[PDB]
Every structure is written in structure tokens, then in C-alpha cells.
Design a protein around this nucleic acid. Structure first.
Ligand code: XG4
Ligand code: MG
Ligand code: MG
Ligand code: NA
Length: 429
DNA sequence: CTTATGACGT
DNA sequence: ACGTCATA
């Protein structure tokens, strides 16, 4: 009805880099450019574990979580770059730094929420209103949207760019005619700005990215993945019913795990759109008040989670798995690795303080023990009063030492399969 | 045979 | 404070 909210109050973008770590490595080594390429961690065991894959390499079926030795079977010519290894562990510093390059460019256009090392949300609502005033009812040319897809169009040509343009033309013709709503116009100007943002990013870093533009974070994120790489996608409120009608529930953010599986199992459905049939109370009874409320609105393309003004990460941490045989079975060994972890952390904390005028005040220590399915066996915290690796490693050991079942002080049992140090609770410096 | 992040429940 | 989930 007239009083019914449609969740069209905001313009939100999600900008996500294509094959991020690969591009960073490609920029540094031109030999890797425009080639089937992947980035791995370590190399001894099975060639190393792949965590990023160029789109050339993806065409051969290489994916994330694949051992490099196995990827080579699919793609014999696969080029590999290795994550920096420091103090016996993976060091992601280059990418965190590359991340900052991108975040800083994005932050010139609008307030951003860093969502991961390679992506951020953008609230473009104010920016759109400002650009709209500047444009005096002056129509929007397709030249202003050279990489934009309008999801759901065309409707009513053989090549992809041909279909992109026709859908875009159909969309633009419906704004200029007055067939579309003002939210639609707002989304379009938002997409214009994102084109500019993405141009600035590539010019100034050499990195390409994709983007989604919509009315909320979830639709923005979903939209971004629709036309990767090097393209942006506008998902309108109107496109939602068709989009969601065959959209598997697991594809929506936060529903890719257990909750999503329970939604599918309990309700006996498969697609996001099928959720509209249930009342809010019904959804609440099965999945709780909060989730139920979120699911009722989300299946209608409505989501209110704000873009938090947070450009920097809330936490600074590092970890290392010691699986199977490599599990840490002595006290001396556990302490040595706590020191390696603490040294990297201290290095990152020190730079963080100089860069961002803040200090962590709490240190979180997490371990995993052999034979435990759970990712984390035990979590403990202590005060973080000094940026000193020796103290931090020593304190971390103090808070976890009790775990040691072994009767001998010299040996550690059950052996440790993971160590994790996280600096948290920042305050102004 | 990974290394991170953020959010939420109790 | 601690554990769990979700992301990738
Ligand atoms: N250490 C570690 N780094 C990872 C892992 N998974 C991903 N990364 C790193 C490597 C990734 O480059 C980066 C960004 O994550 P995505 O955006 O999910 N993948 P990409 O940007 O590669 O491709 P596209 O977005 O176009 O699909 O984070 C992991 O399990 N562990
Ligand atoms: Mg990416
Ligand atoms: Mg990403
Ligand atoms: Na090359």
C-alpha cells in the first residue's frame, strides 16, 4: 500500500577487487599479466594452497582451496606467486598495503565500510542527491555507464556487450520517459559515480574491480558477483522478484551456512523468493525474532543494515595451523611459535599506531588441540599494555599453559594444531 | 596441512 | 568473558 516501505531510501554500493592478490602480484611482475595465474600459501605440501585465481586460470577449472599440484593437472601452464613468508609463517603485508591504496581512493567519494581486505561498502545516498541537483533534469547518457549491467534487462544481441547495451538502453529509455521511479534514477546516478570510482581506482593503482549498486548492502554484494570481472551491476528494487525466483537461498550473504540450510530444510524450499509466502511471525518462530524479521524483509529486497563509517579493521591478528604430524608437542616449540606470531603482530601494531593514532588494549589468544573438530579449542584474553613481542608471547603462554594435560612439564599434550594472537579493543592514542 | 576478519548468543 | 557462526 501507500504506507508500505519498499527499502528504497538508500543507494549502497559494494566494490570488490577482481582476483585481488593475483592483481597485486601481476602489477609487481608484468610476466604474470594476462596469464593463467594463482597465488598460494607455502609450497612444500602439494605445491601450496591456492587462495586467489586469475580469471584466465579459472577457465581451466582452477579454484580457491585447491592444492597447486592439483591445479597444474587442470592447467599445465599455470603461473604461481607465493605469499611472503616471514618467521616461518604466511605474511600478508603486501596485500594489506595494497588494500589501503584502494580504500583511500574510495574514501574520497564517500564514507566506506571496509568489509574485507579487498572490498568495501559505500553509502552513496548523499552523493547521488548532490549530483542530481547539479544535473538540471539533464538526461543520463549511456556513455556515462560504459561497464554497467542492468540486472533483468533486456526483456521483451548474440554477443555479451550487445546484450549489455540493449538492457542499458531499455533502462535509460524508461527513466527519460518517466516510466521509472525516482529510486531508479537515484540508483542510476549511483552507478554513474561508481563508474568514476572504479576508473579512479584502476588509473591510480592499476587494479581492476567489480561493483554492485542497489538499495542495501546485501543486494549490492549480490549484484557485484553477477558480472565479474571488470563490470558493475545495478540491481533495482523492481528486478528483485525475478532475480530471487530462481536464486538459491545459499547465495544470499549470511545464509551460506547452517542457518540457510535450516531455512531450506524446515520450510521445504530452495529459492529466496519462496520466502515471501511465510508470515513474519512464522519465520520468527523457526529462526528467532531477529533472523525471522531479517528473512521476512530480505526476500522482498528490503534490508536496513547501515554502512558503518569504518575504514580500518577493528582487530589486528595472526595465526598459523599446525595440522597432523606438525602439531606442536613440546613447551619449547609452543613458546617459539608464540614468539614468531608475537613478533609479526608487534610489527603490525607499531605501524598501526603511527598510521592510525590508536592502540590495542586487549590481546586475545586462541588455540586448537588435536582431535578437536572445532576451529577453536580455547579462547583466553589478557591486557595488552606494551607493544613488545617478548611480553606478548609470554603473556599469551601464561593464559594458555593450563591446557597442557601432560604430566611432564617438558612435553605438551594434547598437541596444539593452531595458535592465534589477536589485538583488539582499540582506543585513541 | 590456511589466514584471516566481523557479528552474534549466552 | 568465552564460544560459535559466516565469510573466503
Ligand atoms: N589467507 C587467506 N587469504 C584469502 C583466503 N580466501 C581469499 N583470500 C584473499 C585472496 C583474494 O584475492 C582476496 C579477496 O577475496 P575474494 O574477493 O573472495 N577473491 P578474489 O578477489 O581473489 O576474486 P574475485 O573477488 O574477483 O572473485 O582475499 C583465505 O582462505 N586465506
Ligand atoms: Mg575480490
Ligand atoms: Mg572480496
Ligand atoms: Na605477461
Amino acid at each position: 500500500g501507500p504506507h508500505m516501505a519498499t527499502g528504497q531510501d538508500r543507494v549502497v554500493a559494494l566494490v570488490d577487487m577482481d582476483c585481488f592478490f593475483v592483481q597485486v602480484e601481476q602489477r609487481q611482475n608484468p610476466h604474470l599479466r594476462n596469464k593463467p595465474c594463482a597465488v598460494v600459501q607455502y609450497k612444500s605440501w602439494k605445491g601450496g594452497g591456492i587462495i586467489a585465481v586469475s580469471y584466465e586460470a579459472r577457465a581451466f577449472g582452477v579454484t580457491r582451496s585447491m592444492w597447486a599440484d592439483d591445479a597444474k593437472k587442470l592447467c599445465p601452464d599455470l603461473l604461481l606467486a607465493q605469499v611472503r613468508e616471514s618467521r616461518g609463517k604466511a605474511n600478508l603485508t603486501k596485500y594489506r598495503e595494497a588494500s589501503v591504496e584502494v580504500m583511500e581512493i574510495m574514501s574520497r567519494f564517500a564514507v566506506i565500510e571496509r568489509a574485507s581486505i579487498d572490498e568495501a561498502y559505500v553509502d552513496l545516498t548523499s552523493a547521488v542527491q548532490e549530483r542530481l541537483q547539479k544535473l538540471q533534469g539533464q538526461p543520463i547518457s549511456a556513455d556515462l555507464l560504459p561497464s554497467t549491467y542492468i540486472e533483468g534487462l533486456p526483456q521483451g544481441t548474440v554477443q555479451k556487450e550487445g546484450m549489455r547495451k540493449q538492457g542499458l538502453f531499455q533502462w535509460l529509455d524508461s527513466l527519460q520517459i518517466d516510466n521509472l521511479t525516482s529510486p531508479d534514477l537515484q540508483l542510476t546516478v549511483g552507478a554513474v559515480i561508481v563508474e568514476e570510482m572504479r576508473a579512479a581506482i584502476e588509473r591510480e593503482t592499476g587494479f581492476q574491480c567489480s561493483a554492485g549498486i542497489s538499495h542495501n548492502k546485501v543486494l549490492a554484494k549480490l549484484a557485484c558477483g553477477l558480472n565479474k570481472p571488470n563490470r558493475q551491476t545495478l540491481v533495482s528494487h523492481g528486478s528483485v522478484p525475478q532475480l530471487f525466483s530462481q536464486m538459491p537461498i545459499r547465495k544470499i550473504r549470511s545464509l551460506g551456512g547452517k542457518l540457510g540450510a535450516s531455512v531450506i530444510e524446515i520450510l521445504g524450499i530452495e529459492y529466496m523468493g519462496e520466502l515471501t509466502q511465510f508470515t513474519e511471525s512464522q519465520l520468527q518462530s523457526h529462526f528467532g525474532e531477529k533472523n525471522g524479521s531479517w528473512l521476512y524483509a530480505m526476500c522482498r529486497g528490503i534490508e536496513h543494515d547501515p554502512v558503518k563509517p569504518r575504514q580500518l579493521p577493528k582487530t589486528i591478528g595472526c595465526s598459523k595451523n599446525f595440522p597432523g604430524k606438525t602439531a606442536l608437542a613440546t613447551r619449547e616449540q609452543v613458546q617459539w611459535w608464540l614468539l614468531q606470531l608475537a613478533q609479526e603482530l608487534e610489527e603490525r601494531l607499531t605501524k598501526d599506531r603511527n598510521d592510525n593514532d590508536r592502540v590495542a588494549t586487549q590481546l586475545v589468544v586462541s588455540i586448537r588441540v588435536q582431535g578437536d573438530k572445532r576451529l577453536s579449542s580455547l579462547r583466553r584474553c589478557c591486557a595488552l599494555t606494551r607493544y613488545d613481542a617478548h611480553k606478548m608471547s609470554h603473556d599469551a603462554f601464561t593464559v594458555i599453559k593450563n591446557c597442557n594435560t601432560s604430566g611432564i612439564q617438558t612435553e605438551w599434550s594434547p598437541p596444539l594444531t593452531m595458535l592465534f594472537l589477536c589485538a583488539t579493543k582499540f582506543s585513541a592514542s
